[PDB]
């Protein structure tokens with residue numbers, strides 16, 4: 063909403079654009095999860111690394127649940143139990159235009175981060 | 184971060200500021216997961232809401248697995264199995280300065296979105 067604005071009575075800026083500072087705060091943090099988490103899960107998933115050279119991050123990994131149900135101790139799928147996806151709403155930056163008139167714009171993308179096992183209702 | 188540069192063959196501006204266009208692409212979307220997914224999951228989790236007025240989005244919801252083990256049909260924790268979190272790297276905007284000198288800078292935050300049930304290692 064009003065998070066990107068200025069008070070009307072402010073000195074104008076061409077294009078009706080805002081100031082985006084350089085540098086990503088915490089650009090260094092790394093995600094840490096169990097190894098092969100998407101295989102060892104009772105509700106395994108597969109990963110698709112979607113790519114876009116005009117988007118930051120360029121690589122956005124989407125997950126897809128491997129089965130309709132969950133896996134049990136034996137390694138068998140159990141359809142009495144459901145494998146459901148977990149969605150995270152995120153933000154990525156899109157790079158607009160060519161030449162020196164390059165600009166950026168926020169984009170909202172929903173990411174499926176993996177799957178969990180639920181009991182159907 | 185080479186991503187936010189302009190072609191060298193361009194006339195330099197200020198000291199270092201990019202152009203952020205107004206509007207959020209696809210702002211109209213809303214994550215849709217199973218009802219009470221966080222409770223019906225064999226590896227359930229609770230939600231902790233953090234709030235910061237100078238950040239977009241303001242509310243970043245962190246998740247925390249309720250148990251060490253997963254839960255069986257009966258309803259008891261089974262530590263032969265593990266409730267582990269799923270972490271996603273996201274981008275949030277941080278608001279800097281006040282009034283007309285308002286400026287924005289990207290910030291990366293790891294969000295723990297929910298939990299899945301895995302086999303121990």
Ligand SMILES: *[C@@H]1O[C@H](CO)[C@@H](O[C@H]2O[C@H](CO)[C@@H](O)[C@H](O)[C@H]2NC(C)=O)[C@H](O)[C@H]1NC(C)=O
Nearest residue numbers: 100101106107108109110125126127128129130
């Ligand atoms: C999940 O990913 C696996 C890759 O490990 C997919 O693999 C299956 O289908 C492939 C088709 O090209 C075959 O090459 C694989 O041999 C086959 N193996 C397995 C274990 O699935 C699989 O289809 C994907 N599953 C889903 C639901 O998308």
Ligand SMILES: *[C@H]1O[C@H](CO)[C@@H](O)[C@H](O)[C@H]1NC(C)=O
Nearest residue numbers: 222228229230247248249250
């Ligand atoms: C989740 O765990 C918290 C403690 O961290 C507990 O107080 C809360 O009530 C739990 N959730 C439910 C639905 O009981």
